[PDB]
Nucleic acid binder design. Structure first.
Ligand SMILES: [Mg+2]
Ligand SMILES: [Mg+2]
Ligand SMILES: [Mg+2]
Ligand SMILES: [Mg+2]
Ligand SMILES: [Mg+2]
Ligand SMILES: [Mg+2]
Ligand SMILES: [Mg+2]
Ligand SMILES: [Mg+2]
Ligand SMILES: [Mg+2]
Ligand SMILES: [Mg+2]
Ligand SMILES: [Mg+2]
Lengths: 185, 57, 141, 126
RNA sequence: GGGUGACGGGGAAUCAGGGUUCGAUUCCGGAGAGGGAGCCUGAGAAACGGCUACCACAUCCAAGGAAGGCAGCAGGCGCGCAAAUUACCCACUCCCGACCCGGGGAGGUAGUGACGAAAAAUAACAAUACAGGACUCUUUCGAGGCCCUGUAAUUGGAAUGAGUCCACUUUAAAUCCUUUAACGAGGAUCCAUUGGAGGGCAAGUCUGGUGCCAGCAGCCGCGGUAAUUCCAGCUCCAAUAGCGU
């Protein structure tokens, strides 16, 4: 007997037909567009979407004006709106099924860095985010997969305690200044 | 019947060769970038009866 | 045809129970038989002492000597002809030395050219044969 | 000078004889303030010395312009050496402990089971 | 009646709808303390870190006698394909006691730990030499560049953690993360791997060796002197801190 959780789960599903070709080609394209690290990063999004679609289906199988559906569906829609995937006005559950990977990728941090100028190419963007150069709201978001809430998009900019965001310059520029001071001068 | 003699015949008398040098190859995302770039943007040419990613005449 | 009626459950469920035993794979897994016969007494692998290096001749259309190892298992006392895979690998295996043996992928059925060989040598004297072939580890002395 | 401090979730524990609250430290550009400095700043804020102020459980956030942790202000030291954990007093040396080290105590008491009555023997033991 | 690679359940794994299999294993219930039996105390035991026998193992004996039970926690032997430190602490959670104060291998804390799960680095940008193509221009050749992609020169400085390490915090005391000073990148370096490249099935009719041999090959097969299948080098492909059996 202990404290301790043991409550976990995989964030993804591996594909059955492992060399579909058209599947591989599509997934690669998705890594290109949004400078993703690896295939499993695609697959975890595919899995998250799939859950949502699974919920949408289940709610649709229920009768309309059943409290279970009305509550959960509304909550699922509000959740999707909050991340800036579904549009207000388009909130009525049958629209969830008509939705795609591309939308979920688009609202990463790595995207909304690159999207709001800030980066200069998506691979730059991902590096920045890793290197503690951008801050969402007030926290230095180290992680690119950080799905940016629609609410909290316009509060994405550079980290205050950094070179790019107006602060102490990084160690390389400091080294070159010391070299020019003592070595050259 | 049949002897256990020649055991490692071909592994033995093969001509040994040095494994060359080239470069520290790109890894992780960088690799995947590079492979994306050499299917979808760099080449995309006028076709001449199908392609071959390890082709050789 | 089918029993079908509403209060049949039992009839249906019993007949299916009866017929399951003509499903070859089921019978393998529910009668003892195979677990009795398997020298790996329901196990993925088995250690066992090598007691002679023995050439198996390949089955008709392919002509080749195979270079097996007669193993005796530690757990059971049963004997085996494990296939020593990869080129010149037999020379690593010297007599009376502690090999780990696995299945050959087929779960009792022999494989390809080899007659009567369910088993392949994995490790030699607690080292791993792949590693010796590569030239990574070395046989201790 | 440039730290700044806040006091969140303040409570007046009349019946443990204390004020007690969540200290929430702003401290951008510096390396998580030590507890001595936090106490002294709390003392000038609450006008009741550093002696009766006991502070702990500071956890810095990510990025590093904010730590958060619990603190409390007793009325007097006489009270704070009564309803207070011993380690937290010894944290600033005012109720230190013995250096017997558990295991040795157990071995001593496991001998003594061996012998009856003799107070001198049971004093001896080990 | 026999069997069970049978403790029951909650639950777990697969899964369209059905099912199939698993559930020694942290909660609940049971049963047991080498094996069988008998009982004292007690509200509660047919107790085993209580006793009495027998059996089976074993330990001192001055040989008359005497003591013993890790399916507690560490650890050993052994068995095996198959499994962690004789670590620190009563600070938390609870328990027990006559008790605000004592005790707790219950419990917590580190150590080992690729069982498995989450996140996630191994480079980014720039002008160059260039190499190309939607636009504008040009009969074509050539050019103007919002657009851009590959290879180089590391050419250029900029950004950075891995790491080394004062200090704080953490903590029972520590560690770890977090915070943070100071050092800390030209890849010859801080080097990504495991499996493939005839089909199934993503990817060489390339080059060298062997010649039904050695060997590969889950299956179909390849090997008998132009091997797309063997051993090698080169390139390429898949997944990637993982991937094979
Ligand atoms: Mg049984
Ligand atoms: Mg239980
Ligand atoms: Mg009992
Ligand atoms: Mg025992
Ligand atoms: Mg008993
Ligand atoms: Mg015991
Ligand atoms: Mg293991
Ligand atoms: Mg324990
Ligand atoms: Mg993992
Ligand atoms: Mg590396
Ligand atoms: Mg294939």
């Amino acid at each position: 007997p202990v404290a301790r959780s043991w409550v976990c789960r995989k964030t993804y599903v591996t594909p059955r037909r492992p060399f579909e070709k058209s599947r591989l080609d599509q997934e690669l394209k998705l890594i290109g567009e949004y400078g993703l690290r690896n295939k499993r990063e695609v697959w975890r999004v595919k899995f998250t979407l799939a859950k949502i679609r699974k919920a949408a289906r289940e709610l649709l199988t229920l009768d309309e004006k059943d409290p279970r559906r009305l509550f959960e569906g509304n909550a699922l829609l509000r959740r999707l709106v909050r991340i800036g995937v579904l549009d207000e006005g388009k909130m009525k559950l049958d629209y969830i099924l008509g939705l795609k990977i591309e939308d979920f990728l688009e609202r990463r941090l790595q995207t909304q860095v690159f999207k709001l100028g800030l980066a200069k190419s998506i691979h730059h963007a991902r590096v920045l985010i890793r290197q503690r150069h951008i801050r969402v709201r007030k926290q230095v978001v180290n992680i690119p997969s950080f799905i940016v809430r629609l609410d909290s998009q316009k509060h994405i900019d550079f980290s205050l305690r950094s070179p790019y965001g107006g602060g102490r310059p990084g160690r390389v520029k400091r080294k070159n200044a010391k070299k020019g001071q003592g070595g050259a001068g | 019947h049949g002897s256990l003699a020649r055991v490692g015949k071909v592994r033995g008398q093969t001509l040994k060769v040095a494994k060359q040098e080239k470069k520290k190859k790109r890894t992780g995302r960088a690799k995947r970038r590079m492979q994306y770039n050499r299917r979808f943007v760099n080449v995309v040419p006028t076709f001449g009866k199908k392609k071959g990613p390890n082709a050789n005449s | 045809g089918k029993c079908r009626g509403l209060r049949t459950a039992r009839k249906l469920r019993s007949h299916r129970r009866d017929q399951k035993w003509h499903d070859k794979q089921y019978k393998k897994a529910h009668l003892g038989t195979a677990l009795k016969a398997n020298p790996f007494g329901g196990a993925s692998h088995a250690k066992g002492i090598v007691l002679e290096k023995v050439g198996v001749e390949a089955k008709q259309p392919n002509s080749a000597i195979r270079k097996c190892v007669r193993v005796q298992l530690i757990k059971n006392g049963k004997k085996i002809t494990a296939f020593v895979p990869n080129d010149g690998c037999l020379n690593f295996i010297e007599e009376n030395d502690e090999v780990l043996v696995a299945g050959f992928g087929r779960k009792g059925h022999a494989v390809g050219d080899i007659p009567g060989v369910r088993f392949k040598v994995v490790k030699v004297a607690n080292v791993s044969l792949l590693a010796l072939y590569k030239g990574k580890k070395e046989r201790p002395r | 000078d440039t730290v700044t401090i806040r006091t969140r979730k303040f409570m007046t524990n009349r019946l443990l004889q204390r004020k007690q609250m969540v200290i929430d430290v702003l401290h951008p550009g510096k390396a998580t303030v030590p507890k001595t400095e936090i106490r002294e700043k709390l003392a000038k804020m609450y006008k009741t010395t550093p002696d009766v102020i006991f502070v702990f459980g500071f956890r810095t956030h990510f990025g590093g312009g904010k730590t958060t942790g619990f603190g409390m202000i007793y009325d007097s030291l006489d009270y704070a050496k009564k309803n207070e954990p011993k380690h937290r007093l010894a944290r600033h040396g005012l109720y230190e402990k013995k250096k017997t080290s558990r295991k040795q105590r157990k071995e001593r008491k496991n001998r003594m089971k061996k012998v009856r009555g003799t107070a001198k023997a049971n004093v001896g033991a080990g």
